[PDB]
Amino acid sequence: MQLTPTFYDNSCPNVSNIVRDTIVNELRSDPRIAASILRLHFHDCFVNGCDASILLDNTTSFRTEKDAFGNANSARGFPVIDRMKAAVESACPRTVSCADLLTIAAQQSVTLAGGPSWRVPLGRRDSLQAFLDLANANLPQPFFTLPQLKDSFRNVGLNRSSDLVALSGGHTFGKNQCRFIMDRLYNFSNTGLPDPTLNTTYLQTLRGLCPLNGNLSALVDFDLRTPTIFDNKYYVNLEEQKGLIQSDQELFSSPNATDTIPLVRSFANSTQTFFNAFVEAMDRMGNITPLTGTQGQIRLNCRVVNS
Numbered sequence: 140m141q142l143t144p145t146f147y148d149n150s151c152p153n154v155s156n157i158v159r160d161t162i163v164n165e166l167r168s169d170p171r172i173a174a175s176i177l178r179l180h181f182h183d184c185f186v187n188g189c190d191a192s193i194l195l196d197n198t199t200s201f202r203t204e205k206d207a208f209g210n211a212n213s214a215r216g217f218p219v220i221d222r223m224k225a226a227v228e229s230a231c232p233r234t235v236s237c238a239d240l241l242t243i244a245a246q247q248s249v250t251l252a253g254g255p256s257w258r259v260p261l262g263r264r265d266s267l268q269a270f271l272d273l274a275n276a277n278l279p280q281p282f283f284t285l286p287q288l289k290d291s292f293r294n295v296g297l298n299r300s301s302d303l304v305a306l307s308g309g310h311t312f313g314k315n316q317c318r319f320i321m322d323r324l325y326n327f328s329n330t331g332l333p334d335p336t337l338n339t340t341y342l343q344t345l346r347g348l349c350p351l352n353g354n355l356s357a358l359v360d361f362d363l364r365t366p367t368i369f370d371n372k373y374y375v376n377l378e379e380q381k382g383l384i385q386s387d388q389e390l391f392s393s394p395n396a397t398d399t400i401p402l403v404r405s406f407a408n409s410t411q412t413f414f415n416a417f418v419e420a421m422d423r424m425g426n427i428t429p430l431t432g433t434q435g436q437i438r439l440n441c442r443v444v445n446s
């Protein structure tokens with residue numbers, strides 16, 4: 140069954156409004172929640188598609204994706220999803236799936252952070268199991284080279300370099316742990332030297348935030364220009380070699396970036412171009428192997444399968 144943006148227009152026309160309100164209140168006490176929710180949707184879609192499998196807690200039969208290298212002590216905002224889920228369930232009993240709910244939450248997060256506004260396709264249903272192993276194999280790592288980054292995206296169904304470059308724009312806000320850049324700052328690829336593609340002036344700043352043998356869990360902003368605003372500044376940083384993690388700067392500095400370089404500049408020069416590309420890429424990621432029709436179910440508690 141084809142996904143459609145009007146899927147809940149009769150059964151729950153206030154779904155997006157409820158999701159938005161939940162995020163608006165949360166943002167007052169946690170300005171990071173918007174970035175966190177977008178990332179949860181990303182991690183959900185890259186593992187067996189956008190089926191809310193990532194929201195599932197542990198069971199004696201299958202392990203939770205929350206303990207995957209890419210989610211453990213990293214992914215956050217799960218309680219917030221439960222909150223909007225409960226609210227939507229009150230307004231529309233057994234109607235909105237967790238998969239669709241997370242997709243909407245991601246879209247609203249982007250808009251609330253100042254990003255584009257659009258209606259995401261709906262009609263996805265919830266999985267009957269979680270996929271820890273698949274999450275460890277599919278979720279890309281900050282130390283991936285451009286070829287590996289491209290491979291990771293193609294693996295889940297995104298062949299276009301525009302998908303990678305546009306979706307990587309999600310780093311226009313949010314936090315990153317010192318842990319993932321220690322190598323770039325003091326010993327990149329066993330050279331005993333910092334990553335040469337990292338601006339030397341910025342290198343000094345990052346070294347002060349992440350000293351050697353310091354707190355590896357300390358947080359740093361992905362975008363030094365506008366840490367919490369969803370804009371194309373992320374790409375301007377790349378042009379000046381100010382991308383935060385290796386996977387960011389390679390989109391512009393990798394020897395295999397002949398196709399990504401023009402895309403980075405394109406999005407850097409025009410907000411509209413980036414926003415259009417971001418929306419397009421987001422809907423493509425949102426269309427990865429979804430469960431539709433009668434497949435899967437409408438989970439009442441996103442943490443457990445219905446019984």
Ligand code: HEM
Pocket residue numbers: 171173174175177178181212213214215279280281282283288306307308309310312313314315316319384386
């Ligand atoms: C191209 C591959 C990518 C890699 C290797 C990558 C890597 C990372 C890493 C290492 C973190 C920091 C986690 C932590 O410190 O706990 C992170 C955070 C984040 N990423 Fe990415 N990422 C990628 C793609 C994306 C995509 C496609 C999106 C969404 C469109 C996204 C959205 C985010 C957000 C918003 C955060 C901040 C989360 C928060 O502050 O809670 N990332 N990413």
Ligand SMILES: [Ca+2]
Pocket residue numbers: 182183184185186187188189190191192193
């Ligand atoms: Ca999933």
Ligand SMILES: [Ca+2]
Pocket residue numbers: 310311312362364365366367368369370371372373
């Ligand atoms: Ca920004």
